[PDB]
Amino acid sequence: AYVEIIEQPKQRGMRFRYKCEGRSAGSIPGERSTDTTKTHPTIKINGYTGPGTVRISLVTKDPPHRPHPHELVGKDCRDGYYEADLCPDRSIHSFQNLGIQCVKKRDLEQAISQRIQTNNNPFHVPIEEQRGDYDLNAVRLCFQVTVRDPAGRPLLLTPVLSHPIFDNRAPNTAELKICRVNRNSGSCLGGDEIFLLCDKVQKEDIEVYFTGPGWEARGSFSQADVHRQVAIVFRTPPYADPSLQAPVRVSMQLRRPSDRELSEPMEFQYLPD
């Protein structure tokens, strides 16, 4: 009798709200929920259908999953965690009212104290091993399901995790997007100056990736040409064929080195001199 996530939460998109904000945040989306149809976090208990209880807890992103300072708020929640009974006659349970409320780097310690005083530590990470910096732009849901063994006495299953959730406030992980481009056609010898407006990017972890069939180049630009994270001015790289006779469509796009992530491609036409 174990637990498995049927429907993981959406990773990026939703922004955690502070306590001083909306008495209410939002509600965590499934991961296949769309504008048309909305879904939600859903686990599946294998080898058990009957009376029990479930607790959803907030933990840290990486390995030593210490309980996160952030508070899960909404229906049936309290002390930063969610808890309610399991449908005794169903094996699948989705939670449609999960809300993340983030704490301030200031009230950090006070928050950690409440995870302790309230006994919230699903991986029993030690008081000694609890020390360290906490990533406040991400978390994981930790489902601690409690069924009953065949005898009839409560049975706490293994705590399972969900891939990490990310605050739509962390540009180190948001989605790349190109918004404008004052020029999508230059010389095949390259060197053409190009003004590109975009979405918040990080000047040290970004580059214009010109891809082609079997070809691959980058635009030339210095970290200081990344204008306030929303505009890059760079010069086109020379195409594979320097004597081009006929114009050739090429794929141009934003690339964040740290993770190989790529924005949608934007058509660019290399031309004979």
Binding site: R180, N182, E193, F195, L197, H227, R228
Partner: protein, 312 residues
């Protein structure tokens, strides 16, 4: 008679106010003409007097009715929000380098203002002009009432609450007060205080040095309509215009604007617009004009930046 006078006015814009939490020494204030090498030394001067003198500097508001500002003047020779330097017995010209404004927080605006009125009534630093009308009886008499009564604490509590419901934390003024040595030698002789131009916080969205960082094209046909990509420093979509222009023969100016809508204003830092038609679409030779940005709200402009209109 003996008086006080400003030889050099602070620059009004281009300076950032600094919060406590940001730390110390981020830049001093400035004066006119800030030539390439940094040359401003703002210098007041005592006139029709030459001898020992005390000059104090306080932060006041930019309303119709002068008042103490909750903000603090910090740095060289400053203490309790006031800058106190002495005017040499011979040299009567005072300068004020390394002077920074300390931006108080919104939440601590009342109590900080209340404590500044207290310190100014204790030291007798212009209490009647800045805190309240009927407190002028408290003059710096080598310590004009080193101890405030319980009725004087009630005048300050009422002036504080009343002046905080309307204090522009984004603009402030300097006010110099000179004190000459009386009989005893104690500088209690007050001269008519003189206030300075206004100085606007550069971290105000409506006052950062409006600047045109780069432009993909610095020339254009006289028929205009051409599309230009321009990056810039923080600007407000709805509160900004690109203004083309040129000095005329008669002294007047040809004015033309860029065509673009608030949606064309990319993430506060750039603007895609369309050149305006030049005054004369049929010249035979190119003509140079100027192009700048410009807040509607306060009509402040960026630096005239050259543009060339050519025929077609």
């Amino acid at each position: 008679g003996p008086y006080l006078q400003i030889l050099e006015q602070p620059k009004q814009r281009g300076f950032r106010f600094r919060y406590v939490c940001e730390g110390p020494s981020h830049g001093g204030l400035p004066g006119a003409s800030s030539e390439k090498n940094k040359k401003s030394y703002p210098q007041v001067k005592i006139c029709n007097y030459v001898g020992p003198a005390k000059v104090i500097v306080q932060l006041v508001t930019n309303g119709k009715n002068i008042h103490l500002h909750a903000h603090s003047l910090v740095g060289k020779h400053c203490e309790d929000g006031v800058c106190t330097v002495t005017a040499g017995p011979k040299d009567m010209v005072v300068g004020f380098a390394n002077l920074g404004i300390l931006h108080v927080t919104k939440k601590k605006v009342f109590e900080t203002l209340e404590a500044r009125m207290t310190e100014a009534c204790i030291r007798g630093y212009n209490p009647g002009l800045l805190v309240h009308s009927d407190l002028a009886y408290l003059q710096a008499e080598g310590g004009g009432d080193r101890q405030l009564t319980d009725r004087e604490k009630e005048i300050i509590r009422q002036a504080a609450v009343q002046q905080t419901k309307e204090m522009d934390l984004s603009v402030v003024r300097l006010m110099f007060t000179a004190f000459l040595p009386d009989s005893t030698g104690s500088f209690t002789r007050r001269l008519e205080p003189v206030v300075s131009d206004a100085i606007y916080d550069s971290k105000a969205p409506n006052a950062s040095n409006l600047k045109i960082v780069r432009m993909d094209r610095t020339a254009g046909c006289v028929t205009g309509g051409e599309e230009i990509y321009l990056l810039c420093d923080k600007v407000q979509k709805d509160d900004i215009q690109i203004r083309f222009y040129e000095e005329e023969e008669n002294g007047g100016v040809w004015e033309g604007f860029g065509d673009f809508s608030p949606t064309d204003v990319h993430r506060q830092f750039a603007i895609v617009f369309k050149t305006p038609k030049y005054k004369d679409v049929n010249i035979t030779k190119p003509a140079s004009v100027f192009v700048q940005l410009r807040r509607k709200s306060d009509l402040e402009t960026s630096e005239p930046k050259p543009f060339l209109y050519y025929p077609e």
